[PDB]
Amino acid sequence: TINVTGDGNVFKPSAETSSTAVPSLSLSPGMLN
Amino acid sequence: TINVTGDGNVFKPSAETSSTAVPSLSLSPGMLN
Amino acid sequence: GNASSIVQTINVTGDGNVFKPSAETSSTAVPSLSLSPGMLN
Amino acid sequence: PGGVPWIAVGDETSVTSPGALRRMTSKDIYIDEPLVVVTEHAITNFTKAEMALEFNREFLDKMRVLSVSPKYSDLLTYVDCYVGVSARQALNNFQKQVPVITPTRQTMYVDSIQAALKALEKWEIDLRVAQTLLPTNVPIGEVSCPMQSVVKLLDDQLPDDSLIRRYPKEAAVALAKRNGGIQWMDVSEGTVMNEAVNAVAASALAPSASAPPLEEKSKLTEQAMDLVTAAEPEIIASLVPVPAPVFAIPPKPADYNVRTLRIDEATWLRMIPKSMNTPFQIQVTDNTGTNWHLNLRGGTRVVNLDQIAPMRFVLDLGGKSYKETSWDPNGKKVGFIVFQSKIPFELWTAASQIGQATVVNYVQLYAEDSSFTAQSIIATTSLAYNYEPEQLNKTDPEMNYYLLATFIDSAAITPTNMTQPDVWDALLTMSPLSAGEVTVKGAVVSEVVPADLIGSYTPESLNTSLPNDAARCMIDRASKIAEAIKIDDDAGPDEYSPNSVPIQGQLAISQLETGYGVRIFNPKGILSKIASRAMQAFIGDPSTIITQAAPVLSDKNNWIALAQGVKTSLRTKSLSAGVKTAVSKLSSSESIQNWTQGFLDKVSAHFPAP
Amino acid sequence: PGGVPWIAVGDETSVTSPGALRRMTSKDIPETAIINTDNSSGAVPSESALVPYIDEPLVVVTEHAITNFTKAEMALEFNREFLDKMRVLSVSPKYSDLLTYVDCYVGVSARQALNNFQKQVPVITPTRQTMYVDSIQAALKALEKWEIDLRVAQTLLPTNVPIGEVSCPMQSVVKLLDDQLPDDSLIRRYPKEAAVALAKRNGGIQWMDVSEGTVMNEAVNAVAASALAPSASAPPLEEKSKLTEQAMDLVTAAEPEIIASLVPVPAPVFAIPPKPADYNVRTLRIDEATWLRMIPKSMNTPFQIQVTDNTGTNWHLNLRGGTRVVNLDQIAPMRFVLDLGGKSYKETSWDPNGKKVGFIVFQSKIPFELWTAASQIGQATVVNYVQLYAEDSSFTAQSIIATTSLAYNYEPEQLNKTDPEMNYYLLATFIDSAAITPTNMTQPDVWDALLTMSPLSAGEVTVKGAVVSEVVPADLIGSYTPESLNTSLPNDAARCMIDRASKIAEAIKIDDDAGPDEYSPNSVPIQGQLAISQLETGYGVRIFNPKGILSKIASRAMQAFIGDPSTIITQAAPVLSDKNNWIALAQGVKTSLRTKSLSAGVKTAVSKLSSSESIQNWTQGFLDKVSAHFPAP
Amino acid sequence: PGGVPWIAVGDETSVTSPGALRRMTSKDIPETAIINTDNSSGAVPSESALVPYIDEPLVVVTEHAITNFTKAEMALEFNREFLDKMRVLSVSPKYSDLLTYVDCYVGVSARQALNNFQKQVPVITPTRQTMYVDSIQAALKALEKWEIDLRVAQTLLPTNVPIGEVSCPMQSVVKLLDDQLPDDSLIRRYPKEAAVALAKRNGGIQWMDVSEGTVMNEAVNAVAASALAPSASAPPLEEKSKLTEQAMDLVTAAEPEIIASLVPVPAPVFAIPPKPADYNVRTLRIDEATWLRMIPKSMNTPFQIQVTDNTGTNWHLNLRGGTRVVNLDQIAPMRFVLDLGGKSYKETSWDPNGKKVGFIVFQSKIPFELWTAASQIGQATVVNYVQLYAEDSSFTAQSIIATTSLAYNYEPEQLNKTDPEMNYYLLATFIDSAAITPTNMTQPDVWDALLTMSPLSAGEVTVKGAVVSEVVPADLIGSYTPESLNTSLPNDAARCMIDRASKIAEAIKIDDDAGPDEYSPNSVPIQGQLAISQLETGYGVRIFNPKGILSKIASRAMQAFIGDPSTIITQAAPVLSDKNNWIALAQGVKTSLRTKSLSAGVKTAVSKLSSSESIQNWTQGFLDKVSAHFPAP
Numbered sequence A, B: 001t002i003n004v005t006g007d008g009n010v011f012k013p014s015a016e017t018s019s020t021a022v023p024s025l026s027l028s029p030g031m032l033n
Numbered sequence C: 001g002n003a004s005s006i007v008q009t010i011n012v013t014g015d016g017n018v019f020k021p022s023a024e025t026s027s028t029a030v031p032s033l034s035l036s037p038g039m040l041n
Numbered sequence D: 001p002g003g004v005p006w007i008a009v010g011d012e013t014s015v016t017s018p019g020a021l022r023r024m025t026s027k028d029i030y031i032d033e034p035l036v037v038v039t040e041h042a043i044t045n046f047t048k049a050e051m052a053l054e055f056n057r058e059f060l061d062k063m064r065v066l067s068v069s070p071k072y073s074d075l076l077t078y079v080d081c082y083v084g085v086s087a088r089q090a091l092n093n094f095q096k097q098v099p100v101i102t103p104t105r106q107t108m109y110v111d112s113i114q115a116a117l118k119a120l121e122k123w124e125i126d127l128r129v130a131q132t133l134l135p136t137n138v139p140i141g142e143v144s145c146p147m148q149s150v151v152k153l154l155d156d157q158l159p160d161d162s163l164i165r166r167y168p169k170e171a172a173v174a175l176a177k178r179n180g181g182i183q184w185m186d187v188s189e190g191t192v193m194n195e196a197v198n199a200v201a202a203s204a205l206a207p208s209a210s211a212p213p214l215e216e217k218s219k220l221t222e223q224a225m226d227l228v229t230a231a232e233p234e235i236i237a238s239l240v241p242v243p244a245p246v247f248a249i250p251p252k253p254a255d256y257n258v259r260t261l262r263i264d265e266a267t268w269l270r271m272i273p274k275s276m277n278t279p280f281q282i283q284v285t286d287n288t289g290t291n292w293h294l295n296l297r298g299g300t301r302v303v304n305l306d307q308i309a310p311m312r313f314v315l316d317l318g319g320k321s322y323k324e325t326s327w328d329p330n331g332k333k334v335g336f337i338v339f340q341s342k343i344p345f346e347l348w349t350a351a352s353q354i355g356q357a358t359v360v361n362y363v364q365l366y367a368e369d370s371s372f373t374a375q376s377i378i379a380t381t382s383l384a385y386n387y388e389p390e391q392l393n394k395t396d397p398e399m400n401y402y403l404l405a406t407f408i409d410s411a412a413i414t415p416t417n418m419t420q421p422d423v424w425d426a427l428l429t430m431s432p433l434s435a436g437e438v439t440v441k442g443a444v445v446s447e448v449v450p451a452d453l454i455g456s457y458t459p460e461s462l463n464t465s466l467p468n469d470a471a472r473c474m475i476d477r478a479s480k481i482a483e484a485i486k487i488d489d490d491a492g493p494d495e496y497s498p499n500s501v502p503i504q505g506q507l508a509i510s511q512l513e514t515g516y517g518v519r520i521f522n523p524k525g526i527l528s529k530i531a532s533r534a535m536q537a538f539i540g541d542p543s544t545i546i547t548q549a550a551p552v553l554s555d556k557n558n559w560i561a562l563a564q565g566v567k568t569s570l571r572t573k574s575l576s577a578g579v580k581t582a583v584s585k586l587s588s589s590e591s592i593q594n595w596t597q598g599f600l601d602k603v604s605a606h607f608p609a610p
Numbered sequence E, F: 001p002g003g004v005p006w007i008a009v010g011d012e013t014s015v016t017s018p019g020a021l022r023r024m025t026s027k028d029i030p031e032t033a034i035i036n037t038d039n040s041s042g043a044v045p046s047e048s049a050l051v052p053y054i055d056e057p058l059v060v061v062t063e064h065a066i067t068n069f070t071k072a073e074m075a076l077e078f079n080r081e082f083l084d085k086m087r088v089l090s091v092s093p094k095y096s097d098l099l100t101y102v103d104c105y106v107g108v109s110a111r112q113a114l115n116n117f118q119k120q121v122p123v124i125t126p127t128r129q130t131m132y133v134d135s136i137q138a139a140l141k142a143l144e145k146w147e148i149d150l151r152v153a154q155t156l157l158p159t160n161v162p163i164g165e166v167s168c169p170m171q172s173v174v175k176l177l178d179d180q181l182p183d184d185s186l187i188r189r190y191p192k193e194a195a196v197a198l199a200k201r202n203g204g205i206q207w208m209d210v211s212e213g214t215v216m217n218e219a220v221n222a223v224a225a226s227a228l229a230p231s232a233s234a235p236p237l238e239e240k241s242k243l244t245e246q247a248m249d250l251v252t253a254a255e256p257e258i259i260a261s262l263v264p265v266p267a268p269v270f271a272i273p274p275k276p277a278d279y280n281v282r283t284l285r286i287d288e289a290t291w292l293r294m295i296p297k298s299m300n301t302p303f304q305i306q307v308t309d310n311t312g313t314n315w316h317l318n319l320r321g322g323t324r325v326v327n328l329d330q331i332a333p334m335r336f337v338l339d340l341g342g343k344s345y346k347e348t349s350w351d352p353n354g355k356k357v358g359f360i361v362f363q364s365k366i367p368f369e370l371w372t373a374a375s376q377i378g379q380a381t382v383v384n385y386v387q388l389y390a391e392d393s394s395f396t397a398q399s400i401i402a403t404t405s406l407a408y409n410y411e412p413e414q415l416n417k418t419d420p421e422m423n424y425y426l427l428a429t430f431i432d433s434a435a436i437t438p439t440n441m442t443q444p445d446v447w448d449a450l451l452t453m454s455p456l457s458a459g460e461v462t463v464k465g466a467v468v469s470e471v472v473p474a475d476l477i478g479s480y481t482p483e484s485l486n487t488s489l490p491n492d493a494a495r496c497m498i499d500r501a502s503k504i505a506e507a508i509k510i511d512d513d514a515g516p517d518e519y520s521p522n523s524v525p526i527q528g529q530l531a532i533s534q535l536e537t538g539y540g541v542r543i544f545n546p547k548g549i550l551s552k553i554a555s556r557a558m559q560a561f562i563g564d565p566s567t568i569i570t571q572a573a574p575v576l577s578d579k580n581n582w583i584a585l586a587q588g589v590k591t592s593l594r595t596k597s598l599s600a601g602v603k604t605a606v607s608k609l610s611s612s613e614s615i616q617n618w619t620q621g622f623l624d625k626v627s628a629h630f631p632a633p
């Protein structure tokens, strides 16, 4: 329901919107008990 | 009770009187579950 | 094609018509029927 | 249900009541006719048959034809009486609201359908031209192209006689009736909308971006099961006698040159001892009694016409020299001469030894010149004789029958004038004349064991085999098996597949058994790899199973396990396909999508829109 | 039923004309619009911002299609033990849920849908339909190799028996699979689930419930196997119908009436895909094939000539008595490729090595056999040439030409022969940049080589050397000689004919399993024609034979056809030369085939049972080997 | 639906619950027990002592099974009179009598049985359902000879005709069968039963019931015959549905996804079963077969070498230039059979008779060309050999070799390729116990013979004499010259392409029937791929053409494709060179079949109708020959 090659979209990469999802979590065996 | 060698019996091959008995049936094991 | 002063048809050579051949819309009409006579009884 | 409606007369209800049931005519609902019970399946099919007609409704009502729909379900009649085929079976079967019909009304219906489909015999062709001149279907994804361009193309390539040129709008709407990829604006409202009707029918005909479409999966495994069934896997891997009229198959002819052959390998030849210093001359008559004089000598060769599984022989002499100092082949004759005697052909030195003799057909030769300078060449001869043991009507078991082809002339040929003991030095074609006998290594037989044909043959014996031999039938049925595997199997070089592991199991327990010779242990991986290679070898050449001294296919147990495991391997599939199969298929499909998009782009740039 | 749900426009029950209706749309029946659909299997997203709110057409499913698509789901369920491990498709789609039953006028045109009202018509939208077919075949991609693994476990050792039953303790065979399953097989990681899944689809495998020690059958396909087992007296049922239609597929493909038709039959309806044919040109009797025009033998006439190729590049060649050229007209556009490999030609003064040959095409009004000079060739050119190399052969002190593939394809559609008297001829011979001496080039041609031919058209049918668009396929019975066939053009009708007849021949053998003299339902078609034809007043002395004779005489002829098809087009065949018998032969086949009711030959039954049990005897033999070398504890 | 009857034990569950469902056994539904089966047909004993008293699982019978297993019952009932004349199956099975209609959770697995709650599902046990099919199939055994006798009464004289109606008096036709049927016929035994069975299956035959002097139709198959019966306007619907399906079947086999691919495709996917081929190494042009190595000639070098075999016995032979070998590497294992039969090889001091020849395998770093001494061969072994027997031939005074079968099969995995710098060659020539004078023999080897070459690998293919894992179908079109094909391998991509794409040609011809120089729906994709190939601006002199011309070019080109499908691969092919030509045609054949509607060609149908009447005319001419010889009172 969105137009990939239409107009209206914006491409403004910024410092405040730098991509990241889930690099690593802290799952130490000592931490998890 | 029928006169095989008597008169009055009708023999008249018509295309519309084509002859079949039971050639085949569809017994694919997939379609019988 | 328009044979009338006022048109309310479908302009074949008009605009707005769509041609998007897709796999999901692979054309077919009636290739074969299961006219096997054993199954027709 | 299915059959014919029945009506009772007497007051009986018990099953197997003697005179309970009698047929029900039409009157029991002028011209009173019997009635038949239609089935659900036939109703569905015939209604679908009508739905083809309305795919072209627009062109029809434009053409003033068939202004009211056939409506098959209407012509029916509804009753609830006894129904069946035999009275003693209908008597225990009584359904509700069965559909019934007169034969004549049913004929009238199907005739209306048939004649209707007759009329459109050309309009359909024109529509096919329209949909096929450029790609209106794609394997994967979706392509597109502006309508002005494509329409400008059609008005540029369709033949002037095409019905589209004179009946446009109905053709367009019919096109959209089965192609969801073409839509027409509705200027009344200004909306675009799918109009295609075969929606669900096309879903199964579609990919899924990970798997191949369903239809080729189902159909390919259909052909696999069909081949393996028609190959008769029980018989081919049997272990007991089987009558040839069961085992036998339609055979193919063979090519031979009798002089080139080994006398001992070919069990179906007799020869007069070389350097025996005996040259006698004998005379035979034709079917009109004319006496021809022929000369025999040591080095002669014949065929033992007994135990042959009646055959047809045609000889071909083309290319051979047969030139001689005082004996030019040109102008001469050759023939097929039959010899009937009790004496072995190794014991013939005089004339009256020959018993009864006849010539069955003869030809005249011709002599031209060839590539080599000053050398003469014979024409193509097709001299033939089809053999049947009925005509000669064997009576005495000691009676023997020999066939020979050599020169014949109506004057007594001086033996020193010519040195060839025969003219079997010639390409010979041998074609089976019956289809209900099978031989073995040149020996006739009546009860073969399809197992023990494994590994019983050397290659030169295979090339010296008769055309109607059990080995060739084994080859051809196992060949059908080989395709069945190839359609199924896709495992590449050195890879296990569900069509190679029976070999693996046979080997694995063979390694653990107790017999003759040293033991050679191997890990399981080598066994599996070997079995894969051996199965692929069988796929490469079916004839290699019967081969003596084969690597793996020389074992009967391997062959039996392979043949039987094939059945389960196919039957246990569940709408599945191999991995490389799917990956390559999808990749190729996407490539073709790119091709189609580029082509339709060429169209759009070569046929602009306003 | 089938079609598309049509709605009444305007008023209720005001339908009176085909123009008073309209295709329904998911707006009209909002239940079938994707904000409502039961999202079981989690296909459509849950963002309210990614949903069309755009209506779509409605389509009707057919009662014989729901049965098919439900079973499509059944394929997955044979693997749900692995799926939930794979954690995919936790709830089976259950196609019936996506359907909705509304009642209306249904059809594939407003006209006929008017007259066709129905109650409780299932409906679906194309977008939703694609989701379901996806929902199945998407998961199939996951099963790709779990499928392969278990299909191995079924077939590594015999788990199906043709007849009876066989036995072995589990604890033994498991040790074997442990000994042989590839280390990358999923079974080695998921034994339990693999064990269950097999027992779903194999009655014999039967695991035990440790809680109360009960063993029962788990086969879900107990009915499919029913028609796959044999009885104690006849082959299994599933295959006979499979076997019996399969002959009936060959006959219809062979179109019996056409190959037994007395009226004229056109070419493109009769012509069928051809086969390459091979001939040698010098060896052919000139008076056999009409497509060989040869200048009279021993002509002894010397005549040199200059010719120009397609670029005019001059080539030189001589003509002499015995030169043979192909009568290029009526050849039905054809492809000649010539193969000279092996022949020597090495004369005493003129070596072949380092020379060229080529096809030459001749065009003139004058008949070719009457040629003496260059004014009679008309117009002539070369069309291709090659180069010849030499080697040494088995016969010492003479060389041998290497293999050649001189080629040229003939098509009349481009030459545009517009005057019948204008005559087209083709020769192959030596060509060179310099005139050659007649005393040295004594070879009349280069036709002493194997030659291959392939038709470049499937609409032209040739008979007896020539081509005619009309054929009567009744007359080709027994109207050729053995000499005719090898001289026959590659696209000869009798060549095409026996190909069509071959399937008819094959279809019989699948049915018949009779021996010598044995009257079959496919033998008696001839027997009757022999019955009358013997009794009628034919040419010659009337001779009488009894019924038993006419059986066997027909019986031999039957198989003589099955053994080899070329006997139907053979001069003076035993019976087959009769046009009449071939007619009555085919029309026997259909009635024979269509009146079979689930049975095979009496011989076939006795063979199959005795054979099949031998495997059961054998399979146990294999099996008891395992229990020995893999002992049960 | 399908699956298995599932019973619930969870007792507070809806869906996906851990332990809700359990199998439903015959104790849960006692009606499905084998003490309560209706003993009609008596197939289970009535003695109390003999019943297992055990329980068995229950399974579900679907729509299609009931509608089919019941359909099987008619095959008996078409022959019901002979049964009771035979006193077997006094009561028809009436399959719907052995079921139990229940409503519970149903499905192959518990997971999808858990939301599938149906009503009146039929239910059966393996044993009760097994007993049913035994009842049916026993009767088929009983009717085994009846069926053969019934058919031969029908297939004796023509009783069905494709078109119209014929006629024959009864007393003639009954008299005709009288004398010509076999003495041991069951018809002779029970003739009135043979009378009743025909009218049940053949409407034409009708029996006047003497009670009223009436007569009517009796055939039970009236509806089906119409589907197989022509109208006088077009062929019957039956095969018009069938002659089209085979095309869709043949196309499915070819997989036009592959043969239209523009990307590399793994060899096992592309591969097809191969066929034997033939070659002659001596005459094989060295530059065309890129797999033959040859020591040059005219150096004067000459020597001998000695090489043992697997048995350890030594051997003596020669070597010299001109010698040809095969590069065993990258030839995808082959089997080699070489028949010396037909060659001379005689030399002034060396006849070939009595001696032996055999195969030799070599192994080295040094390439076979540089070989000039004895220590450059590295490793060697003699892998097979046979003796020579020379008879004599037509060619006067000169003896010839008899048939030979020197056989060997190259296998890489045994040969255990390890070194990238290795090299392997195969050589066949004279070998002997004692050494040979290098001048008593002169032949560089014995390759002047016939070789047969069959592949052994399956999923691995070569292109231009080189093996490769991936292959692109498009990069083959129009690049194999006529020479290069002949000098190619058996297991070649081109040959693998010729056959697989040939199946298209079978499909095209059975669907279309275009005559010379007129279009066809399969000629048209080419016809489109040209106009745009022409209109664009490019190299050369652009050539313009009307669609009337553009049409015919394809119309001819499509015909050429059918006759020789291997023409497309020919380099510099006339029209089919372009890949776009091949793609457009190959893709469209699928479409042109999907869109057919029970339609015959305009040309085709008339010929069938014209044929059909002639056969009708033939029959009535025959039917009078019954009248003239078998009159009636």
Ligand SMILES: *C(=O)CCCCCCCCCCCCC
Binding pocket: C001, C002, C012, C013, D151, D154, D155, D156, D158, D164, D165, D168
């Ligand atoms: C409208 O202005 C009438 C004339 C234009 C009709 C369209 C061209 C006629 C044929 C239909 C489409 C062209 C391709 C067949």
